[PDB]
Amino acid sequence: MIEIKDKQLTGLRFIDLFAGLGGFRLALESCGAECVYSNEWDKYAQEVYEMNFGEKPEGDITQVNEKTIPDHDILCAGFPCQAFSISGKQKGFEDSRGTLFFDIARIVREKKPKVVFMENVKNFASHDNGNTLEVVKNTMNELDYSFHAKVLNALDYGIPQKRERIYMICFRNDLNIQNFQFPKPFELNTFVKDLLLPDSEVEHLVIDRKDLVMTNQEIEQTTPKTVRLGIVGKGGQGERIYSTRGIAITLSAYGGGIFAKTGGYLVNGKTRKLHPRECARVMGYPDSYKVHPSTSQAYKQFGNSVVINVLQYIAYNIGSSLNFKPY
DNA sequence: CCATGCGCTGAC
DNA sequence: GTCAGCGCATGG
Numbered sequence: 001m002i003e004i005k006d007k008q009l010t011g012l013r014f015i016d017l018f019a020g021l022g023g024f025r026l027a028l029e030s031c032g033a034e035c036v037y038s039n040e041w042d043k044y045a046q047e048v049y050e051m052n053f054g055e056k057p058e059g060d061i062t063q064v065n066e067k068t069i070p071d072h073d074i075l076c077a078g079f080p081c082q083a084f085s086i087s088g089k090q091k092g093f094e095d096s097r098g099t100l101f102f103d104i105a106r107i108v109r110e111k112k113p114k115v116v117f118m119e120n121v122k123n124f125a126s127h128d129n130g131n132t133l134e135v136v137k138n139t140m141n142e143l144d145y146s147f148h149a150k151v152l153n154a155l156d157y158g159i160p161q162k163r164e165r166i167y168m169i170c171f172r173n174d175l176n177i178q179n180f181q182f183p184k185p186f187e188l189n190t191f192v193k194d195l196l197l198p199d200s201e202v203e204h205l206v207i208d209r210k211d212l213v214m215t216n217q218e219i220e221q222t223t224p225k226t227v228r229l230g231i232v233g234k235g236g237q238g239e240r241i242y243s244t245r246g247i248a249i250t251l252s253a254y255g256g257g258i259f260a261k262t263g264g265y266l267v268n269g270k271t272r273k274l275h276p277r278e279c280a281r282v283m284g285y286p287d288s289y290k291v292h293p294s295t296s297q298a299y300k301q302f303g304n305s306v307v308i309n310v311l312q313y314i315a316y317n318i319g320s321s322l323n324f325k326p327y
Numbered sequence: 328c329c330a331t332g333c334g335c336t337g338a339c
Numbered sequence: 340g341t342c343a344g345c346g347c348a349t350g351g
């Protein structure tokens with residue numbers, strides 16, 4: 001994450017739905033906003049959340065009575081994506097874990113926050129010939145909100161990972177917010193190689209497979225793109241190796257393959273997957289964030305999470321729009 | 328639970 | 340064509 005001088009969200013309360021690791025919490029708090037409610041049903045996720053924020057999030061949002069949720073100014077929600085991801089089945093709203101947006105909508109209908117800040121995978125935008133997105137848009141509008149949506153790639157915001165996510169910012173209509181803008185992209189000055197842990201701390205992650213196929217030579221100059229240096233097996237998900245002079249591929253929650261959830265990287269002559277701390281870093285999490293003790297659970301958590309830096313820029317721009325109240 | 332080989336969709 | 344994806348299924 002980065003340092004935020006002007007705390008644009010000072011005095012604003014927000015809720016952290018589908019909390020996960022609390023990325024939205026890191027982002028909005030860094031802007032001066034106060035978290036007054038969190039909800040996350042996964043046992044282990046609740047563990048890390050509590051480990052870092054000192055409170056356990058409420059469980060199953062589908063059973064939470066909308067009316068019990070504390071009044072708030074900004075509702076934050078990076079809802080489930082398995083039902084929309086390009087990597088899954090794409091069953092959408094007809095999937096058990098694909099109807100959560102309606103719970104969010106049910107909550108908004110009752111508490112009318114000033115802002116609804118949501119996030120989901122890039123494929124969400126084009127899913128089901130845009131109807132899924134349209135549904136969200138129309139739902140937001142009927143609730144009397146503007147709807148601002150855009151896919152932003154983490155690589156354009158200072159983090160070496162090609163995580164393309166759609167962000168939807170909605171402002172309550174009576175606020176007449178006409179100046180909201182998604183942050184402008186800037187040059188990448190950080191690469192995978194710059195976030196790695198010392199070799200001593202990561203030897204156990206080295207996999208020596210006899211089927212490594214060097215598809216491309218390592219590169220001498222750093223580049224803001226994912227450079228595949230080779231595959232293993234059939235080169236499917238979890239079986240591709242990339243240059244550390246480039247950027248990280250998208251971290252995943254239930255990803256498979258020998259380099260599950262992080263992908264392989266050619267490091268100082270060797271081939272290995274990322275360590276949970278490196279995943280923390282690739283997601284913009286500060287080194288002070290305590291990762292969950294179970295590696296498998298930490299890999300999953302980070303793969304489901306958000307890039308803090310991107311949220312901090314957006315969160316700042318939401319605050320800028322809210323503060324412009326001239327006579 | 329943890330590990331892994333998918334095996335296809337979508338974006339160009 | 341080329342190649343990457345907050346995934347799935349199945350083994351133990």
Ligand SMILES: Nc1ncnc2c1ncn2[C@@H]1O[C@H](CSCC[C@H](N)C(=O)O)[C@@H](O)[C@H]1O
Nearest residue numbers: 018019020021023040041042060061078305
């Ligand atoms: N019905 C439900 N009630 C509460 N939490 C739920 C839920 N269904 C899914 N979730 C949780 O919502 C999350 C979606 S992924 C969101 C990650 C979060 N943005 C972060 O910063 O890490 C997962 O942690 C999942 O366990």
